[PDB]
Protein backbone atom coordinates (compact mmCIF):
# COMPACT_ATOMS: atom_id res chain seq x y z
CA UNK A 1 0.00 0.00 0.00
CA UNK A 2 2.70 2.46 1.05
CA UNK A 3 5.00 3.51 -1.80
CA UNK A 4 7.73 6.11 -2.31
CA UNK A 5 7.98 8.20 -5.48
CA UNK A 6 11.61 8.07 -6.64
CA UNK A 7 10.97 10.79 -9.24
CA UNK A 8 9.49 13.31 -6.79
CA UNK A 9 11.94 12.47 -3.99
CA UNK A 10 14.83 12.82 -6.46
CA UNK A 11 13.44 16.07 -7.90
CA UNK A 12 13.37 17.75 -4.48
CA UNK A 13 16.81 16.34 -3.64
CA UNK A 14 18.28 17.94 -6.77
CA UNK A 15 16.91 21.34 -5.74
CA UNK A 16 18.31 21.01 -2.20
CA UNK A 17 21.70 20.06 -3.69
CA UNK A 18 21.89 23.51 -5.31
CA UNK A 19 23.15 26.12 -2.83
CA UNK A 20 22.49 29.03 -5.20
CA UNK A 21 18.71 29.47 -4.85
CA UNK A 22 16.65 30.46 -1.80
CA UNK A 23 15.99 26.82 -0.87
CA UNK A 24 17.54 24.87 2.03
CA UNK A 25 14.81 22.61 3.47
CA UNK A 26 12.07 20.53 1.85
CA UNK A 27 9.03 18.66 3.20
CA UNK A 28 8.13 15.00 2.71
CA UNK A 29 4.51 13.84 2.95
CA UNK A 30 2.40 11.15 1.29
CA UNK A 31 -0.86 11.90 -0.53
CA UNK A 32 -3.40 9.08 -0.81
CA UNK A 33 -0.86 6.25 -0.90
CA UNK A 34 2.42 7.67 -2.21
CA UNK A 35 5.24 9.68 -0.60
CA UNK A 36 6.19 13.00 -2.21
CA UNK A 37 8.32 16.06 -1.21
CA UNK A 38 6.66 19.25 -0.01
CA UNK A 39 7.34 22.92 0.74
CA UNK A 40 10.82 24.16 -0.18
CA UNK A 41 11.95 27.44 1.37
CA UNK A 42 14.91 29.18 3.00
CA UNK A 43 12.77 30.23 5.98
CA UNK A 44 12.64 27.33 8.44
CA UNK A 45 9.98 29.22 10.43
CA UNK A 46 7.47 27.73 7.98
CA UNK A 47 8.59 24.20 8.84
CA UNK A 48 8.27 24.80 12.59
CA UNK A 49 4.71 26.11 12.18
CA UNK A 50 3.71 23.37 9.72
CA UNK A 51 5.23 20.56 11.82
CA UNK A 52 2.92 20.64 14.86
CA UNK A 53 2.19 17.87 17.37
CA UNK A 54 -0.88 16.60 15.48
CA UNK A 55 0.28 14.48 12.49
CA UNK A 56 3.18 12.46 11.02
CA UNK A 57 5.48 13.37 8.12
CA UNK A 58 9.08 13.39 6.86
CA UNK A 59 11.55 16.20 6.18
CA UNK A 60 14.88 16.98 4.51
CA UNK A 61 17.10 19.93 5.46
CA UNK A 62 20.73 20.58 4.51
CA UNK A 63 23.14 22.64 6.64
CA UNK A 64 26.51 24.19 5.78
CA UNK A 65 29.19 24.14 8.48
CA UNK A 66 31.85 26.63 7.43
CA UNK A 67 33.32 30.06 8.16
CA UNK A 68 35.97 31.38 5.74
CA UNK A 69 38.05 28.35 6.72
CA UNK A 70 36.15 25.22 5.64
CA UNK A 71 32.90 25.75 3.74
CA UNK A 72 31.11 22.39 3.54
CA UNK A 73 27.54 21.05 3.43
CA UNK A 74 25.81 18.21 5.28
CA UNK A 75 22.55 16.28 4.85
CA UNK A 76 19.95 15.89 7.61
CA UNK A 77 16.80 13.73 7.55
CA UNK A 78 14.23 14.89 10.10
CA UNK A 79 11.17 12.73 10.85
CA UNK A 80 8.36 14.64 12.57
CA UNK A 81 5.62 12.69 14.35
CA UNK A 82 3.06 14.84 16.16
CA UNK A 83 1.48 13.01 19.14
CA UNK A 84 -1.75 12.67 17.13
CA UNK A 85 -0.15 9.70 15.36
CA UNK A 86 -2.75 6.92 15.11
CA UNK A 87 -1.76 3.25 15.37
CA UNK A 88 -1.73 2.85 11.59
CA UNK A 89 0.32 6.04 11.18
CA UNK A 90 2.64 5.04 14.05
CA UNK A 91 3.76 1.84 12.30
CA UNK A 92 3.84 3.77 9.02
CA UNK A 93 6.60 6.02 10.42
CA UNK A 94 9.03 3.12 10.84
CA UNK A 95 8.09 1.62 7.47
CA UNK A 96 8.35 4.98 5.69
CA UNK A 97 11.76 5.57 7.29
CA UNK A 98 12.97 2.43 5.49
CA UNK A 99 11.63 3.61 2.12
CA UNK A 100 13.38 6.99 2.39
CA UNK A 101 16.54 5.28 3.68
CA UNK A 102 16.93 3.45 0.36
CA UNK A 103 15.95 6.55 -1.65
CA UNK A 104 18.74 8.59 -0.02
CA UNK A 105 21.96 6.62 -0.55
CA UNK A 106 24.21 9.55 0.39
CA UNK A 107 23.13 11.04 3.74
CA UNK A 108 24.72 12.43 6.91
CA UNK A 109 22.28 12.13 9.82
CA UNK A 110 18.68 10.95 10.14
CA UNK A 111 16.60 10.80 13.33
CA UNK A 112 13.05 11.15 14.65
CA UNK A 113 11.82 14.13 16.68
CA UNK A 114 8.70 14.67 18.81
CA UNK A 115 9.43 18.18 20.14
CA UNK A 116 9.44 21.62 18.49
CA UNK A 117 12.57 22.58 20.44
CA UNK A 118 14.25 19.31 19.38
CA UNK A 119 13.22 19.79 15.74
CA UNK A 120 14.32 23.44 15.83
CA UNK A 121 16.97 24.51 13.32
CA UNK A 122 19.54 25.09 16.09
CA UNK A 123 18.99 21.55 17.35
CA UNK A 124 19.30 19.87 13.94
CA UNK A 125 22.48 21.74 13.01
CA UNK A 126 23.92 20.95 16.46
CA UNK A 127 23.59 17.19 15.89
CA UNK A 128 25.18 17.53 12.43
CA UNK A 129 27.99 19.79 13.68
CA UNK A 130 28.86 17.58 16.66
CA UNK A 131 28.13 14.10 15.25
CA UNK A 132 29.84 12.60 18.30
CA UNK A 133 30.49 15.16 21.02
CA UNK A 134 30.52 15.13 24.83
CA UNK A 135 26.92 16.36 25.12
CA UNK A 136 28.25 19.85 25.94
CA UNK A 137 25.06 21.64 24.89
CA UNK A 138 22.66 23.92 26.78
CA UNK A 139 21.20 26.70 24.62
CA UNK A 140 21.77 24.90 21.31
CA UNK A 141 24.38 27.53 20.37
Tab-separated table of N, CA, C and O in Angstrom, residues 42-134:
chain	number	residue	atom	x	y	z
A	42	UNK	N	13.724	28.844	2.211
A	42	UNK	CA	14.908	29.176	2.998
A	42	UNK	C	14.523	29.499	4.441
A	42	UNK	O	15.346	29.387	5.351
A	43	UNK	N	13.263	29.898	4.645
A	43	UNK	CA	12.767	30.233	5.978
A	43	UNK	C	12.264	28.985	6.699
A	43	UNK	O	11.208	28.446	6.363
A	44	UNK	N	13.027	28.519	7.688
A	44	UNK	CA	12.644	27.326	8.443
A	44	UNK	C	11.413	27.583	9.310
A	44	UNK	O	10.720	26.642	9.697
A	45	UNK	N	11.137	28.858	9.610
A	45	UNK	CA	9.978	29.222	10.426
A	45	UNK	C	8.722	28.511	9.925
A	45	UNK	O	7.887	28.070	10.718
A	46	UNK	N	8.606	28.397	8.600
A	46	UNK	CA	7.465	27.732	7.976
A	46	UNK	C	7.386	26.264	8.389
A	46	UNK	O	6.299	25.745	8.644
A	47	UNK	N	8.540	25.601	8.456
A	47	UNK	CA	8.588	24.195	8.837
A	47	UNK	C	8.143	24.002	10.286
A	47	UNK	O	7.380	23.084	10.589
A	48	UNK	N	8.621	24.873	11.173
A	48	UNK	CA	8.270	24.802	12.591
A	48	UNK	C	6.760	24.935	12.799
A	48	UNK	O	6.170	24.211	13.604
A	49	UNK	N	6.144	25.870	12.074
A	49	UNK	CA	4.706	26.108	12.178
A	49	UNK	C	3.899	24.977	11.539
A	49	UNK	O	2.843	24.598	12.048
A	50	UNK	N	4.395	24.448	10.422
A	50	UNK	CA	3.710	23.368	9.716
A	50	UNK	C	3.820	22.046	10.477
A	50	UNK	O	2.864	21.269	10.521
A	51	UNK	N	4.989	21.795	11.066
A	51	UNK	CA	5.225	20.564	11.816
A	51	UNK	C	4.779	20.696	13.273
A	51	UNK	O	5.599	20.914	14.168
A	52	UNK	N	3.476	20.551	13.506
A	52	UNK	CA	2.921	20.642	14.856
A	52	UNK	C	2.619	19.248	15.404
A	52	UNK	O	2.529	18.281	14.642
A	53	UNK	N	2.470	19.147	16.724
A	53	UNK	CA	2.185	17.868	17.373
A	53	UNK	C	0.744	17.423	17.111
A	53	UNK	O	-0.091	17.416	18.017
A	54	UNK	N	0.461	17.050	15.862
A	54	UNK	CA	-0.878	16.604	15.479
A	54	UNK	C	-0.877	15.958	14.086
A	54	UNK	O	-1.786	16.195	13.290
A	55	UNK	N	0.150	15.148	13.798
A	55	UNK	CA	0.276	14.476	12.489
A	55	UNK	C	1.604	13.717	12.399
A	55	UNK	O	2.329	13.623	13.380
A	56	UNK	N	1.926	13.185	11.216
A	56	UNK	CA	3.181	12.460	11.020
A	56	UNK	C	3.681	12.633	9.587
A	56	UNK	O	2.969	12.319	8.629
A	57	UNK	N	4.902	13.145	9.443
A	57	UNK	CA	5.485	13.367	8.119
A	57	UNK	C	7.011	13.332	8.162
A	57	UNK	O	7.616	13.253	9.234
A	58	UNK	N	7.625	13.402	6.983
A	58	UNK	CA	9.079	13.389	6.864
A	58	UNK	C	9.602	14.773	6.485
A	58	UNK	O	8.824	15.677	6.175
A	59	UNK	N	10.923	14.931	6.512
A	59	UNK	CA	11.550	16.205	6.175
A	59	UNK	C	12.985	16.010	5.692
A	59	UNK	O	13.592	14.962	5.921
A	60	UNK	N	13.520	17.030	5.024
A	60	UNK	CA	14.883	16.980	4.508
A	60	UNK	C	15.500	18.377	4.468
A	60	UNK	O	15.137	19.202	3.628
A	61	UNK	N	16.432	18.634	5.384
A	61	UNK	CA	17.099	19.931	5.459
A	61	UNK	C	18.616	19.770	5.418
A	61	UNK	O	19.174	18.901	6.090
A	62	UNK	N	19.278	20.618	4.634
A	62	UNK	CA	20.733	20.575	4.515
A	62	UNK	C	21.364	21.794	5.186
A	62	UNK	O	20.879	22.918	5.034
A	63	UNK	N	22.442	21.565	5.936
A	63	UNK	CA	23.136	22.644	6.638
A	63	UNK	C	24.600	22.732	6.213
A	63	UNK	O	25.243	21.715	5.952
A	64	UNK	N	25.119	23.957	6.157
A	64	UNK	CA	26.509	24.188	5.776
A	64	UNK	C	27.330	24.633	6.983
A	64	UNK	O	27.060	25.679	7.579
A	65	UNK	N	28.329	23.831	7.341
A	65	UNK	CA	29.191	24.138	8.478
A	65	UNK	C	30.536	24.680	8.005
A	65	UNK	O	31.475	23.919	7.759
A	66	UNK	N	30.621	26.002	7.877
A	66	UNK	CA	31.851	26.632	7.431
A	66	UNK	C	31.918	28.102	7.795
A	66	UNK	O	30.888	28.734	8.038
A	67	UNK	N	33.131	28.650	7.828
A	67	UNK	CA	33.324	30.061	8.162
A	67	UNK	C	34.679	30.566	7.665
A	67	UNK	O	35.636	30.673	8.435
A	68	UNK	N	34.747	30.877	6.368
A	68	UNK	CA	35.975	31.376	5.742
A	68	UNK	C	37.199	30.558	6.145
A	68	UNK	O	38.305	31.085	6.282
A	69	UNK	N	36.983	29.268	6.329
A	69	UNK	CA	38.046	28.346	6.718
A	69	UNK	C	37.798	26.959	6.129
A	69	UNK	O	38.722	26.302	5.651
A	70	UNK	N	36.540	26.527	6.168
A	70	UNK	CA	36.152	25.223	5.643
A	70	UNK	C	34.659	25.195	5.327
A	70	UNK	O	33.851	24.719	6.127
A	71	UNK	N	34.296	25.713	4.156
A	71	UNK	CA	32.898	25.748	3.738
A	71	UNK	C	32.463	24.391	3.197
A	71	UNK	O	32.904	23.972	2.124
A	72	UNK	N	31.601	23.705	3.945
A	72	UNK	CA	31.109	22.392	3.539
A	72	UNK	C	29.639	22.209	3.910
A	72	UNK	O	29.137	22.850	4.836
A	73	UNK	N	28.955	21.328	3.180
A	73	UNK	CA	27.543	21.052	3.426
A	73	UNK	C	27.358	19.705	4.122
A	73	UNK	O	28.297	18.914	4.228
A	74	UNK	N	26.136	19.454	4.593
A	74	UNK	CA	25.811	18.206	5.280
A	74	UNK	C	24.309	17.931	5.219
A	74	UNK	O	23.495	18.838	5.404
A	75	UNK	N	23.951	16.677	4.950
A	75	UNK	CA	22.547	16.277	4.853
A	75	UNK	C	21.959	15.967	6.228
A	75	UNK	O	22.676	15.570	7.148
A	76	UNK	N	20.644	16.147	6.356
A	76	UNK	CA	19.947	15.887	7.611
A	76	UNK	C	18.496	15.479	7.359
A	76	UNK	O	17.702	16.268	6.841
A	77	UNK	N	18.158	14.246	7.732
A	77	UNK	CA	16.803	13.731	7.554
A	77	UNK	C	16.025	13.813	8.864
A	77	UNK	O	16.317	13.086	9.817
A	78	UNK	N	15.039	14.705	8.906
A	78	UNK	CA	14.225	14.887	10.103
A	78	UNK	C	12.843	14.262	9.934
A	78	UNK	O	12.128	14.563	8.979
A	79	UNK	N	12.474	13.397	10.876
A	79	UNK	CA	11.173	12.730	10.848
A	79	UNK	C	10.280	13.262	11.967
A	79	UNK	O	10.496	12.958	13.143
A	80	UNK	N	9.282	14.061	11.597
A	80	UNK	CA	8.361	14.641	12.572
A	80	UNK	C	7.136	13.754	12.771
A	80	UNK	O	6.521	13.302	11.803
A	81	UNK	N	6.779	13.516	14.033
A	81	UNK	CA	5.619	12.691	14.353
A	81	UNK	C	4.808	13.286	15.505
A	81	UNK	O	4.976	12.902	16.665
A	82	UNK	N	3.914	14.215	15.167
A	82	UNK	CA	3.063	14.844	16.165
A	82	UNK	C	2.208	13.828	16.904
A	82	UNK	O	1.578	12.977	16.277
A	83	UNK	N	2.220	13.922	18.239
A	83	UNK	CA	1.485	13.014	19.139
A	83	UNK	C	0.191	12.437	18.568
A	83	UNK	O	-0.186	11.320	18.928
A	84	UNK	N	-0.502	13.169	17.697
A	84	UNK	CA	-1.751	12.670	17.127
A	84	UNK	C	-1.500	11.603	16.060
A	84	UNK	O	-2.223	11.521	15.064
A	85	UNK	N	-0.486	10.774	16.288
A	85	UNK	CA	-0.152	9.697	15.362
A	85	UNK	C	-0.937	8.434	15.713
A	85	UNK	O	-0.651	7.773	16.712
A	86	UNK	N	-1.927	8.106	14.885
A	86	UNK	CA	-2.753	6.922	15.107
A	86	UNK	C	-1.919	5.646	14.975
A	86	UNK	O	-0.802	5.678	14.462
A	87	UNK	N	-2.469	4.524	15.446
A	87	UNK	CA	-1.761	3.253	15.373
A	87	UNK	C	-1.243	2.943	13.979
A	87	UNK	O	-0.081	2.568	13.813
A	88	UNK	N	-2.106	3.106	12.977
A	88	UNK	CA	-1.735	2.850	11.589
A	88	UNK	C	-0.600	3.775	11.146
A	88	UNK	O	0.342	3.339	10.481
A	89	UNK	N	-0.695	5.049	11.526
A	89	UNK	CA	0.323	6.038	11.177
A	89	UNK	C	1.621	5.788	11.952
A	89	UNK	O	2.714	6.003	11.425
A	90	UNK	N	1.488	5.329	13.199
A	90	UNK	CA	2.642	5.038	14.050
A	90	UNK	C	3.563	4.022	13.377
A	90	UNK	O	4.758	4.270	13.211
A	91	UNK	N	2.992	2.885	12.977
A	91	UNK	CA	3.755	1.837	12.304
A	91	UNK	C	4.261	2.328	10.949
A	91	UNK	O	5.334	1.925	10.492
A	92	UNK	N	3.483	3.209	10.316
A	92	UNK	CA	3.843	3.771	9.019
A	92	UNK	C	5.159	4.548	9.101
A	92	UNK	O	5.956	4.518	8.166
A	93	UNK	N	5.382	5.242	10.223
A	93	UNK	CA	6.604	6.023	10.415
A	93	UNK	C	7.847	5.151	10.235
A	93	UNK	O	8.739	5.488	9.455
A	94	UNK	N	7.894	4.026	10.950
A	94	UNK	CA	9.028	3.122	10.840
A	94	UNK	C	9.190	2.566	9.435
A	94	UNK	O	10.302	2.516	8.907
A	95	UNK	N	8.074	2.161	8.828
A	95	UNK	CA	8.086	1.616	7.472
A	95	UNK	C	8.556	2.673	6.471
A	95	UNK	O	9.415	2.405	5.629
A	96	UNK	N	7.990	3.876	6.579
A	96	UNK	CA	8.345	4.983	5.692
A	96	UNK	C	9.826	5.338	5.814
A	96	UNK	O	10.475	5.662	4.818
A	97	UNK	N	10.357	5.265	7.038
A	97	UNK	CA	11.763	5.572	7.286
A	97	UNK	C	12.670	4.647	6.477
A	97	UNK	O	13.754	5.050	6.050
A	98	UNK	N	12.210	3.414	6.260
A	98	UNK	CA	12.968	2.431	5.490
A	98	UNK	C	12.954	2.791	4.005
A	98	UNK	O	13.977	2.690	3.324
A	99	UNK	N	11.788	3.220	3.513
A	99	UNK	CA	11.631	3.608	2.116
A	99	UNK	C	12.566	4.766	1.768
A	99	UNK	O	13.299	4.709	0.779
A	100	UNK	N	12.535	5.813	2.594
A	100	UNK	CA	13.378	6.991	2.390
A	100	UNK	C	14.859	6.634	2.522
A	100	UNK	O	15.699	7.165	1.793
A	101	UNK	N	15.165	5.726	3.451
A	101	UNK	CA	16.540	5.284	3.682
A	101	UNK	C	17.180	4.787	2.385
A	101	UNK	O	18.322	5.132	2.077
A	102	UNK	N	16.433	3.984	1.626
A	102	UNK	CA	16.927	3.453	0.358
A	102	UNK	C	16.995	4.553	-0.700
A	102	UNK	O	17.934	4.597	-1.496
A	103	UNK	N	15.999	5.445	-0.696
A	103	UNK	CA	15.951	6.555	-1.648
A	103	UNK	C	17.197	7.433	-1.522
A	103	UNK	O	17.814	7.796	-2.525
A	104	UNK	N	17.564	7.765	-0.282
A	104	UNK	CA	18.740	8.591	-0.023
A	104	UNK	C	19.949	7.716	0.299
A	104	UNK	O	20.136	7.291	1.440
A	105	UNK	N	20.766	7.450	-0.718
A	105	UNK	CA	21.959	6.620	-0.552
A	105	UNK	C	23.095	7.401	0.108
A	105	UNK	O	23.890	6.833	0.859
A	106	UNK	N	23.168	8.703	-0.174
A	106	UNK	CA	24.207	9.555	0.394
A	106	UNK	C	23.612	10.546	1.393
A	106	UNK	O	23.117	11.607	1.010
A	107	UNK	N	23.662	10.187	2.674
A	107	UNK	CA	23.127	11.039	3.737
A	107	UNK	C	24.181	11.305	4.813
A	107	UNK	O	25.302	10.797	4.737
A	108	UNK	N	23.811	12.101	5.816
A	108	UNK	CA	24.723	12.430	6.910
A	108	UNK	C	24.147	12.001	8.257
A	108	UNK	O	24.792	11.268	9.008
A	109	UNK	N	22.935	12.466	8.561
A	109	UNK	CA	22.284	12.131	9.824
A	109	UNK	C	20.764	12.134	9.686
A	109	UNK	O	20.181	13.077	9.149
A	110	UNK	N	20.129	11.076	10.188
A	110	UNK	CA	18.676	10.950	10.136
A	110	UNK	C	18.136	10.441	11.469
A	110	UNK	O	18.568	9.398	11.964
A	111	UNK	N	17.196	11.183	12.050
A	111	UNK	CA	16.604	10.803	13.331
A	111	UNK	C	15.180	11.336	13.468
A	111	UNK	O	14.774	12.254	12.752
A	112	UNK	N	14.432	10.751	14.401
A	112	UNK	CA	13.052	11.154	14.650
A	112	UNK	C	12.986	12.197	15.763
A	112	UNK	O	13.815	12.198	16.674
A	113	UNK	N	11.995	13.081	15.681
A	113	UNK	CA	11.818	14.130	16.681
A	113	UNK	C	10.344	14.280	17.050
A	113	UNK	O	9.470	14.202	16.184
A	114	UNK	N	10.073	14.500	18.336
A	114	UNK	CA	8.700	14.668	18.813
A	114	UNK	C	8.552	15.945	19.649
A	114	UNK	O	7.637	16.059	20.467
A	115	UNK	N	9.453	16.907	19.426
A	115	UNK	CA	9.427	18.182	20.142
A	115	UNK	C	9.851	19.326	19.223
A	115	UNK	O	10.805	19.194	18.452
A	116	UNK	N	9.138	20.450	19.309
A	116	UNK	CA	9.437	21.621	18.486
A	116	UNK	C	10.840	22.159	18.773
A	116	UNK	O	11.544	22.599	17.861
A	117	UNK	N	11.247	22.107	20.041
A	117	UNK	CA	12.571	22.576	20.438
A	117	UNK	C	13.651	21.623	19.923
A	117	UNK	O	14.750	22.053	19.568
A	118	UNK	N	13.320	20.331	19.870
A	118	UNK	CA	14.249	19.314	19.384
A	118	UNK	C	14.341	19.338	17.857
A	118	UNK	O	15.386	19.023	17.288
A	119	UNK	N	13.247	19.718	17.196
A	119	UNK	CA	13.219	19.789	15.736
A	119	UNK	C	13.680	21.160	15.240
A	119	UNK	O	13.856	21.361	14.038
A	120	UNK	N	13.878	22.100	16.169
A	120	UNK	CA	14.320	23.437	15.830
A	120	UNK	C	15.606	23.389	15.009
A	120	UNK	O	16.393	22.444	15.109
A	121	UNK	N	15.797	24.412	14.192
A	121	UNK	CA	16.970	24.513	13.324
A	121	UNK	C	18.281	24.420	14.108
A	121	UNK	O	19.224	23.758	13.673
A	122	UNK	N	18.336	25.092	15.258
A	122	UNK	CA	19.536	25.095	16.095
A	122	UNK	C	19.855	23.703	16.627
A	122	UNK	O	21.021	23.365	16.838
A	123	UNK	N	18.819	22.900	16.842
A	123	UNK	CA	18.992	21.549	17.351
A	123	UNK	C	19.509	20.616	16.260
A	123	UNK	O	20.443	19.844	16.484
A	124	UNK	N	18.900	20.698	15.078
A	124	UNK	CA	19.297	19.867	13.944
A	124	UNK	C	20.762	20.102	13.583
A	124	UNK	O	21.550	19.159	13.504
A	125	UNK	N	21.115	21.370	13.366
A	125	UNK	CA	22.483	21.742	13.011
A	125	UNK	C	23.479	21.297	14.082
A	125	UNK	O	24.605	20.912	13.765
A	126	UNK	N	23.059	21.349	15.350
A	126	UNK	CA	23.919	20.946	16.461
A	126	UNK	C	24.328	19.482	16.323
A	126	UNK	O	25.507	19.144	16.444
A	127	UNK	N	23.345	18.622	16.058
A	127	UNK	CA	23.592	17.192	15.889
A	127	UNK	C	24.545	16.937	14.722
A	127	UNK	O	25.442	16.099	14.816
A	128	UNK	N	24.342	17.669	13.626
A	128	UNK	CA	25.180	17.529	12.435
A	128	UNK	C	26.598	18.035	12.694
A	128	UNK	O	27.575	17.402	12.288
A	129	UNK	N	26.698	19.182	13.365
A	129	UNK	CA	27.987	19.788	13.677
A	129	UNK	C	28.807	18.903	14.614
A	129	UNK	O	29.988	18.657	14.368
A	130	UNK	N	28.177	18.429	15.689
A	130	UNK	CA	28.860	17.577	16.656
A	130	UNK	C	29.110	16.186	16.078
A	130	UNK	O	30.259	15.791	15.878
A	131	UNK	N	28.030	15.449	15.810
A	131	UNK	CA	28.131	14.100	15.252
A	131	UNK	C	29.063	13.218	16.087
A	131	UNK	O	29.820	12.409	15.545
A	132	UNK	N	29.001	13.384	17.408
A	132	UNK	CA	29.839	12.604	18.300
A	132	UNK	C	30.600	13.471	19.285
A	132	UNK	O	31.827	13.399	19.362
A	133	UNK	N	29.867	14.290	20.039
A	133	UNK	CA	30.492	15.163	21.020
A	133	UNK	C	30.321	14.654	22.442
A	133	UNK	O	29.899	13.516	22.652
A	134	UNK	N	30.646	15.500	23.421
A	134	UNK	CA	30.523	15.126	24.830
A	134	UNK	C	29.260	15.721	25.457
A	134	UNK	O	29.249	16.073	26.639
